[PDB]
Amino acid sequence: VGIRFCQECNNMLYPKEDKENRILLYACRNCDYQQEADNSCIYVNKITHEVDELTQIIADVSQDPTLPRTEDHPCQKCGHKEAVFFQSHSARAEDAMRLYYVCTAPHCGHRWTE
Amino acid sequence: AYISVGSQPSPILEFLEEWSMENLEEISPAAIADATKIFVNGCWVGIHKDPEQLMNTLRKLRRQMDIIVSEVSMIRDIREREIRIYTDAGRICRPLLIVEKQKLLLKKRHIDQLKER
Amino acid sequence: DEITPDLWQEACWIVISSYFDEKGLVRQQLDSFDEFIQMSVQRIVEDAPPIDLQAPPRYLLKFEQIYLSKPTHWERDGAPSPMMPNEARLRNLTYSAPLYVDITKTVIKEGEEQLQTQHQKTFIGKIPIMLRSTYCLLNGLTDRDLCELNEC
Amino acid sequence: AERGELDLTGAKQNTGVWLVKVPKYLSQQWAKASGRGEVGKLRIAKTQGRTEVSFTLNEDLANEHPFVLQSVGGQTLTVFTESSSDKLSLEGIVVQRAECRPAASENYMRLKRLQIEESSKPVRLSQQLDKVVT
Amino acid sequence: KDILCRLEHTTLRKVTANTAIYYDPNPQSTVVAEDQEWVNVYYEMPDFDVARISPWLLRVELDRKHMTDRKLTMEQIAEKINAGFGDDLNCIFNDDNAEKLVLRIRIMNSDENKMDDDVFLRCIESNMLTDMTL
Amino acid sequence: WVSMLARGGQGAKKSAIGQRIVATLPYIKQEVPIIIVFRALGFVSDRDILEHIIYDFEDPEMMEMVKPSLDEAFVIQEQNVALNFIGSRGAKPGVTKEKRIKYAKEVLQKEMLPHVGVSDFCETKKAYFLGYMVHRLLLAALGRRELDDRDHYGNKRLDLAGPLLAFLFRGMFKNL
Amino acid sequence: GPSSQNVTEYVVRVPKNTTKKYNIMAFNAADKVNFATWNQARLERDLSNKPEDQPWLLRVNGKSGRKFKGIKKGGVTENTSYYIFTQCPDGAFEAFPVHNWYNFTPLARHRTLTAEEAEEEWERRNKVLNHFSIMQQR
Ligand SMILES: [Zn+2]
Ligand SMILES: [Zn+2]
Numbered sequence: 001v002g003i004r005f006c007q008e009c010n011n012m013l014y015p016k017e018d019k020e021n022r023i024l025l026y027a028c029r030n031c032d033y034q035q036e037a038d039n040s041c042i043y044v045n046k047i048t049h050e051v052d053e054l055t056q057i058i059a060d061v062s063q064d065p066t067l068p069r070t071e072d073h074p075c076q077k078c079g080h081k082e083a084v085f086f087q088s089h090s091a092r093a094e095d096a097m098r099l100y101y102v103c104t105a106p107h108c109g110h111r112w113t114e
Numbered sequence: 115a116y117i118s119v120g121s122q123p124s125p126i127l128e129f130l131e132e133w134s135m136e137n138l139e140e141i142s143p144a145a146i147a148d149a150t151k152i153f154v155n156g157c158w159v160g161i162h163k164d165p166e167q168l169m170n171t172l173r174k175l176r177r178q179m180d181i182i183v184s185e186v187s188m189i190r191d192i193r194e195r196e197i198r199i200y201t202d203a204g205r206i207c208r209p210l211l212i213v214e215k216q217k218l219l220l221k222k223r224h225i226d227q228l229k230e231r
Numbered sequence: 232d233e234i235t236p237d238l239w240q241e242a243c244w245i246v247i248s249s250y251f252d253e254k255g256l257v258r259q260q261l262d263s264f265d266e267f268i269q270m271s272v273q274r275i276v277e278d279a280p281p282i283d284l285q286a287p288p289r290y291l292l293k294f295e296q297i298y299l300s301k302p303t304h305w306e307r308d309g310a311p312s313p314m315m316p317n318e319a320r321l322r323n324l325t326y327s328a329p330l331y332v333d334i335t336k337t338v339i340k341e342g343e344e345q346l347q348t349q350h351q352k353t354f355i356g357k358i359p360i361m362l363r364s365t366y367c368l369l370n371g372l373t374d375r376d377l378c379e380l381n382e383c
Numbered sequence: 384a385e386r387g388e389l390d391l392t393g394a395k396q397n398t399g400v401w402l403v404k405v406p407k408y409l410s411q412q413w414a415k416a417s418g419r420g421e422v423g424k425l426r427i428a429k430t431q432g433r434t435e436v437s438f439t440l441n442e443d444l445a446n447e448h449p450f451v452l453q454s455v456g457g458q459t460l461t462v463f464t465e466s467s468s469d470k471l472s473l474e475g476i477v478v479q480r481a482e483c484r485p486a487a488s489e490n491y492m493r494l495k496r497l498q499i500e501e502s503s504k505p506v507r508l509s510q511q512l513d514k515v516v517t
Numbered sequence: 518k519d520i521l522c523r524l525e526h527t528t529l530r531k532v533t534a535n536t537a538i539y540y541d542p543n544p545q546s547t548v549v550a551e552d553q554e555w556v557n558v559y560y561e562m563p564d565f566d567v568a569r570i571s572p573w574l575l576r577v578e579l580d581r582k583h584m585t586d587r588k589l590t591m592e593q594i595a596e597k598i599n600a601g602f603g604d605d606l607n608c609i610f611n612d613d614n615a616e617k618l619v620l621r622i623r624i625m626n627s628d629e630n631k632m633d634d635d636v637f638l639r640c641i642e643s644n645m646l647t648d649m650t651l
Numbered sequence: 652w653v654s655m656l657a658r659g660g661q662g663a664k665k666s667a668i669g670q671r672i673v674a675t676l677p678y679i680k681q682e683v684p685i686i687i688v689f690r691a692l693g694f695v696s697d698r699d700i701l702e703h704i705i706y707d708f709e710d711p712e713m714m715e716m717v718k719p720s721l722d723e724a725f726v727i728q729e730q731n732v733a734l735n736f737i738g739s740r741g742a743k744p745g746v747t748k749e750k751r752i753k754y755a756k757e758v759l760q761k762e763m764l765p766h767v768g769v770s771d772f773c774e775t776k777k778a779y780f781l782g783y784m785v786h787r788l789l790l791a792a793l794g795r796r797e798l799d800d801r802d803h804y805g806n807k808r809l810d811l812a813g814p815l816l817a818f819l820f821r822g823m824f825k826n827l
Numbered sequence: 828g829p830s831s832q833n834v835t836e837y838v839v840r841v842p843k844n845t846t847k848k849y850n851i852m853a854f855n856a857a858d859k860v861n862f863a864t865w866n867q868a869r870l871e872r873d874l875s876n877k878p879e880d881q882p883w884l885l886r887v888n889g890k891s892g893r894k895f896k897g898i899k900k901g902g903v904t905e906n907t908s909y910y911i912f913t914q915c916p917d918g919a920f921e922a923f924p925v926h927n928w929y930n931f932t933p934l935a936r937h938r939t940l941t942a943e944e945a946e947e948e949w950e951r952r953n954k955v956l957n958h959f960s961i962m963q964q965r
Pocket of ligand 1: 009029030031033
């Protein structure tokens, strides 16, 4: 799943196997450089791709004046009463009406979903 | 509605350089992720690590008409970590009353002064 | 102090009145034209590369500064006169202002001698003038003055 | 030993230098002094768990400049010089980055307004003629 | 509803949670303990693959909800994949009791015994997800 | 224009790699792969090009989006080779390679993203902006950013008499 | 100790003119440069154009070491300045303006497909198979 570049010419490293050792290797095309593979997973394709939207949220959104603010959902970390909530509005979800809360307290960008 | 006539972005660019904005030619690409891109008239000028302070400063300057003229647009896309500044002609704008702390900055003294226009 | 709701309706239309007392209703037209004459025309002339001739003597031409006079009309006898907008409407004239530019001509004759002459205010054409713009004759005329010119 | 060879003695000495960006007025004042021999003094105050860096403008030069440090891990900056004798040399490696900011909040903008006015002084614009050129 | 399922097109992508490709050199200790629990059972007395087996592995995780909605069975999917590709690929799947539905896919042993062995498995992955009809 | 090819095309190689990004530069008949344009700018190593397109390598979803584009331009691994490739499609055929490279540099220097810069030292500035365009395209494809609305008047300008007249005057003064 | 409340003050000196101009050399952090291995270094102007208005070319340890190409920074510091502070025995800081800013990017040293040969690989527009094998032929 990870992406690596050869230390020689900083080009994309692609997977390759060695029959003699039967161990996964990452080899650079234009460089002939080789590296020992530690992940063992060439790639993972997520059809559902249920990526946690909380990671995608930016804590700075609390500074948006147009986002609604609720005092009924205190921050779980710092306990601040005021919080700003919004919807994902991210494509490829095929369904999105749940609210994502972000603590409005400065220096506490805590984010959660009820 | 008013249509902006346009003005030079030079004063804004100079102020941004004076302010704590890192030039695009001097930074490393790794620093762009956390910082917010600064666009002036569609040209990516640099990045800033304190967008909230910069926007407050920019808004203060435009309201005081110090370095930023009235018809200059300052847009901060908080989600996209971008600050877009526009100075060119053809932008449609309208005058709006400023509100701070749920209070109009327009007070009775302004109305009284206008009454004797 | 603070505008109470009982006085907001009067207060807001005092604000709107002052806006139109200043801006008017065709401000976008006039401001755009004023910028073109005041800034764009000069910038376009300044941005133009100097004309270099070489075919030996070398001639350089640089267009320095732009001048614009009042909208003028020339009688068949050649006498200039200010062109009132009403005269332009009646006599089917074009409301245009003469355009002049300062041109500096420097010649290098390969003899290590440079001769520089400036042709101040060289006529380069006529720019149609938007009415009631900063460069229009009606600009800065009181309503009484406009009536004397048969202008509404 | 060759003309194109670059001296690396400074790097071998692990020489440390600081990269600082300064405003125009501070540089302009230094240029105005023309290098008399002194333009100010840099003061560094280190606390139990914090460090403070500031620069003081010379009183004669005028007739505070707090310094904000920046992380250097984002880039590796080294200084190289080209001597007039055509002998390139590496002065050293930058070990800290800082920025100089003014102390004035609002009154500073007045200086900028003049500076913007000075910058716009040579911006020529069309002139209006009372009479048609004859 | 039985007629509805028999008509509405269902490709592998619909009931597939995710697909991953691992090198998987040793089939016994394939990737992680989760596969170890049931992969051995197939490999205690394996058939039609004792000769050889491709190194690269294509692991498919199937959504339980989507499978239940269309009343699809893992054996049927394996037969469908087997029918489409014949003996070109070897399909190993876990029992339905396990909370996670898995389906290990590899390439024929005869080929193991020209494009590439990992890129080709990638082509099959996309081919099975969209073109293959369940 | 920076465009991502549709997935409609069916193939073992096309389907596996995904969708590739191509750039429609001015004065070029045919679409140019995006990674070639970055090579022509002076960024050869994949790490360097991706640093201008992807600002966070920790995100794997965006990295996989540019992989098909890297493979498309794998043949071109030098700036001069990339410049020749763009010049080959130029407005006029290049008699010799030197003319092609010079023409390609001419287009990139001034005809491509002129607002970013029109000088010879603006390659880094154009690489960042071109990477931002690719980055913007990836966000749209990934669904992380909504597609822009043509009807939005934020994305609109009104040409009044001034800009209109100035456009005419530039042509007339050049004629003069 | 004294470090908990240490206070230091140093003077600033700005010499009028210096015999040697000061420039800035920048390397990417991901490049992982190592000055210890820099046994030899050669810095010469590039010859691609064929002087002061051309990019620089940096060569380290001859052909064996990594080769970097320098490019002058396009941006102009008309409203900004850059200075370098160097420690000296006298203890008074010295500020030297930077004449120019240059960015150096490493150059790969391996068989690169020629432009004429790249045309041949263009026929395999997307029909390319086993991308690894392409460089084996070269
Ligand atoms: Zn390599
Ligand atoms: Zn909180």
